[PDB]
Design a protein around this ligand. Structure first.
Ligand SMILES: Nc1ncnc2c1ncn2[C@H]1C[C@H](O)[C@@H](COP(=O)(O)OP(=O)(O)OP(=O)(O)O)O1
Ligand SMILES: [Mg+2]
Length: 216
């Protein structure tokens, strides 16, 4: 198993209400967990616990190895688009091209005379929200890691572009990788190995899409 939570309860503040309550799941190496639920349900907090920023008050957690985290808030640092995507990681042409293709950024980049050397975050180019999200996703996917934590990475994308990048990036390019994707979209839950739906800190549902089907 790559990630386990067993009976996990946690608090951001002593004597507050728990942000996560008796949470249980298991991800095997290479699987995809979809994490869903309304705003404030505790999804990002769950990722924060995996990254060691929040410790459990009850329960046990297992995870090992390097993490790559894609925030739900996309961000750019001053530098070229290539520098923003590799972001201090060693460069490989094939790997870089595979990521930007999977994130549909080849189309955007091809339109600039400077191509991958277009400068971001320095007042010149103003990127759309969807561009900034795809760049932030590409950065997280380019990093080599054992566990990918993708927190609602499809911000500002139309539903078809989201579907295409979910398939090309999360399902195909990252097929061998252990992935936790915070998402509410039906196809993402359907293709996930496991689904965890949170509501106000609690496990609303945990299982497979097919199991949820059989309750209807
Ligand atoms: N660093 C933090 N410190 C204190 N409280 C936090 C912190 N982060 C989140 N919270 C609080 C806010 C919320 O009351 C609760 C759950 O927040 P969070 O896990 O960010 O929800 P979420 O990620 O499911 O919502 P959203 O879909 O809007 O991103 O925890
Ligand atoms: Mg969040």
């Amino acid at each position: 198993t790559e990630v386990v939570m067993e009976n996990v309860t946690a608090f951001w503040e002593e004597g507050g209400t728990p942000v996560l309550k008796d949470i249980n799941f298991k991800i095997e190496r290479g699987q995809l967990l979809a994490v869903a639920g309304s705003t404030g349900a505790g999804k990002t907090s769950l990722l924060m616990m995996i990254m060691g920023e929040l410790e459990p008050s009850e329960g046990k957690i297992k995870h090992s190895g390097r993490i790559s985290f894609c925030s739900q808030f996309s961000w750019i640092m001053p530098g070229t688009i290539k520098e923003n995507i590799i972001f201090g990681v060693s460069y490989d042409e094939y790997r870089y091209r595979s990521v930007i293709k999977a994130c549909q950024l080849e189309e955007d980049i091809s339109k600039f005379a400077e191509k991958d050397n277009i400068v971001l975050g320095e007042g010149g180019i103003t990127l759309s929200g969807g561009q900034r999200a795809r760049i932030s996703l590409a950065r997280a996917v380019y990093k080599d890691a054992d566990l990918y934590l993708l927190d609602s990475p499809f911000g500002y994308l139309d539903v078809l572009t989201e579907k295409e990048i979910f398939e090309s990036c999360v399902c195909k390019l990252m097929a061998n990788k252990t992935r936790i994707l915070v998402t509410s979209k039906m196809e993402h839950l359907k293709k996930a190995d496991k689904i965890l739906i949170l509501h106000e800190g609690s496990s609303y549902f945990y299982g497979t899409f097919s199991e949820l089907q059989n309750l209807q």
